[PDB]
Symmetry: D3
Subunit: 49 residues, 6 copies
């Protein structure tokens, strides 16, 4: 599960893009949620600060 | 500021690489510190949660 | 621009995250808009086909 | 269905690099071609505008 | 194969960040190593110039 | 210089896409060449192992 590491890298970019200036909180956590099936941008707005 | 937005993208990848499994909190306060001047990996490690 | 070439790299990534399977058209003109001032994800969905 | 999404993220960067000033067209479909099997940079030029 | 190819992309970004101005070296021998099991920042320092 | 640092990140991505499995030696001289002026795909192949 370098697979997990790789997914996590993309997830933080996606979080960055969705959340913008409010920023976000990153925990794996989230990755466990979003690396099995794709999380929508709508779903990602949920992890913004 | 398109420039900070671009820099922020690199900054969140760097934070992800350093913090890894610990995860982290991303805020404007880190962007202002590390996208005005370059932060070492040692410094970013201080923002890992 | 040196700036536009790098900015374009980030822009195509944002377009991909936003448009997903719908896909998109990248045209150098999308860059003239979104690399001078920041385009929101909402704005970018407009370039999804 | 994350492996494909992760791959698609890299493919658009490759397209960006190969096509340059020409721009390119991105489609589900191009990803199934180039994320099932590795496409050479030569192959990718086919997707440039 | 595509996964290894993709993983290598993340590996060189990690090496760039870890090595900084020293620069770095990699081979498809090192990519195989750090993409089968995850390499620490410490292990990655081994590939700096 | 933060812009040199950021450009360098994109350059390694490009070098990797071009060199793939062959690998490369990444040094200051290459960032000075390809981050002051844009390097073509042919120019990048010059740095592959
Ligand atoms: Cl940049
Ligand atoms: Cl990946
Ligand atoms: Zn990836
Ligand atoms: Zn950049």
């Amino acid at each position: 599960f370098v697979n997990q590491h790789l997914c996590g890298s993309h997830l933080v970019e996606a979080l960055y893009l969705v959340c913008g200036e409010r920023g976000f909180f990153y925990t794996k956590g989230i990755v466990e949620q979003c690396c099995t099936s794709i999380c929508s941008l709508y779903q990602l707005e949920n992890y913004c600060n």
